Amino acid sequence: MSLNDFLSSVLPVSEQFEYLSLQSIPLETHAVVTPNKDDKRVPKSTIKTQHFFSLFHQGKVFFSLEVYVYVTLWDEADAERLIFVSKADTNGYCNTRVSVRDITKIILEFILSIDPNYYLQKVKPAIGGSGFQQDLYLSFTCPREILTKICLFTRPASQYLFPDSSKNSKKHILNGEELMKWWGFILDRLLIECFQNDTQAKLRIPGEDPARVRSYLRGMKYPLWQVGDIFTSKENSLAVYNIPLFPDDPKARFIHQLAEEDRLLKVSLSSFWIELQERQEFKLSVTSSVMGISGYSLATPSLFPSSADVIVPKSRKQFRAIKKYITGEEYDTEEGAIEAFTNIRDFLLLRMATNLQSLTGKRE
Numbered sequence: 001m002s003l004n005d006f007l008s009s010v011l012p013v014s015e016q017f018e019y020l021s022l023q024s025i026p027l028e029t030h031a032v033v034t035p036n037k038d039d040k041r042v043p044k045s046t047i048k049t050q051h052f053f054s055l056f057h058q059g060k061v062f063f064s065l066e067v068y069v070y071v072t073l074w075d076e077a078d079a080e081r082l083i084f085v086s087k088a089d090t091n092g093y094c095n096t097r098v099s100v101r102d103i104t105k106i107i108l109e110f111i112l113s114i115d116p117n118y119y120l121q122k123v124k125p126a127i128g129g130s131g132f133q134q135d136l137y138l139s140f141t142c143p144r145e146i147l148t149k150i151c152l153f154t155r156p157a158s159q160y161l162f163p164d165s166s167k168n169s170k171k172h173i174l175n176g177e178e179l180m181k182w183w184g185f186i187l188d189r190l191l192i193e194c195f196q197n198d199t200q201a202k203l204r205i206p207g208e209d210p211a212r213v214r215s216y217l218r219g220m221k222y223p224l225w226q227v228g229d230i231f232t233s234k235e236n237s238l239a240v241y242n243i244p245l246f247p248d249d250p251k252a253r254f255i256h257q258l259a260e261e262d263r264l265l266k267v268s269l270s271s272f273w274i275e276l277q278e279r280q281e282f283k284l285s286v287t288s289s290v291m292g293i294s295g296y297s298l299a300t301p302s303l304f305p306s307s308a309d310v311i312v313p314k315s316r317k318q319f320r321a322i323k324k325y326i327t328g329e330e331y332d333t334e335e336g337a338i339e340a341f342t343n344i345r346d347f348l349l350l351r352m353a354t355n356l357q358s359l360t361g362k363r364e
């Protein structure tokens with residue numbers, strides 16, 4: 001089941017769309033969570049990859065989604081993958097009704113189906129060794145059926161990927177409560193459609209008492225949602241030794257604040273959640289939540305994405321240039337959505353002899 005198949009299954013019947021599915025070259029990086037000295041085993045390697053998606057309709061971009069996948073290796077038989085859902089955004093320049101919810105769900109379903117070995121086949125080394133040889137890549141193997149985590153932080157903003165798109169009166173911005181429920185629905189469906197019944201499913205709303213969190217969870221179809229998170233309680237539950245540090249994420253932003261305050265050894269997980277809320281509070285306060293899934297896939301992931309599924313630029317420079325045509329554009333008028341589409345289409349054609357992928361919706 002290709003990305004084309006997945007997207008078509010949730011797009012309106014007989015309607016035409018195009019997509020960009022862009023991916024960075026997998027890179028050896030530091031651990032997701034800050035290591036400690038008391039860990040009897042630390043990761044042998046952590047491999048980070050970015051997937052960046054844009055959907056187009058009628059020659060205009062209207063939706064984008066940024067996802068990072070981390071594969072952490074302890075040895076040949078011991079690995080985990082984590083999908084960090086970073087940013088989802090719209091600009092309101094789609095002239096037809098689509099379910100952005102289902103688009104987002106289905107792209108994550110596609111990512112879950114990818115064999116983690118796909119990211120391990122050709123890994124760019126971290127600078128700290130390997131040395132002078134320029135075209136040297138690492139390769140690893142792991143089992144296909146590995147522990148799979150998904151993490152995201154819900155927090156609304158006028159935009160994340162489409163500058164000034166809130167100036168478009170057609171843009172639909174969810175408030176913090178609606179946005180939590182929206183992502184809640186998406187993850188609930190991923191659990192039911194893609195995860196085994198023994199899976200951890202966690203929700204917390206920083207700064208709030210669990211009673212109200214528990215209230216919401218009662219409407220989920222996955223039967224094992226709990227209030228809390230998927231994080232460990234290493235080192236007397238110090239936040240620094242248990243909180244994953246993700247790109248542009250509020251948790252990492254607050255960890256770095258504690259670092260600047262010299263309090264990383266003073267702040268427990270419980271205080272972290274209170275303070276994360278506390279000290280960004282009044283006029284900018286909106287409902288934020290942290291969601292976590294940890295378990296095994298129902299179907300063993302064995303797909304190595306084709307060129308139709310993903311475009312992997314030969315360099316970070318090319319990757320950056322293409323993504324910037326989306327994120328560096330101005331969307332106060334529809335001309336931004338048109339320009340993003342034309343720039344991307346021309347760049348792909350001119351520099352890569354590639355087309356955006358065409359889709360016809362199949363959903364009745």
Ligand SMILES: CC(=O)SCCNC(=O)CCNC(=O)[C@H](O)C(C)(C)COP(=O)(O)OP(=O)(O)OC[C@H]1O[C@@H](n2cnc3c(N)ncnc32)[C@H](O)[C@@H]1OP(=O)(O)O
Pocket residue numbers: 085086087088089090091098099100101102152153154155156157158159160170171172173174179182
């Ligand atoms: C991890 C993270 O990324 S958190 C950050 C999330 N991103 C942002 O906050 C950026 C700003 N927000 C947005 O871009 C959007 O509001 C999104 C992406 C969150 C959701 O987009 P939407 O277009 O609202 O999504 P979707 O198609 O799923 O529709 C959701 C609901 O809004 C309704 N809706 C959609 N468009 C409109 C509209 N123009 N006017 C009124 N209602 C609308 C739909 O009917 C649906 O209603 P239902 O729940 O009663 O069925």
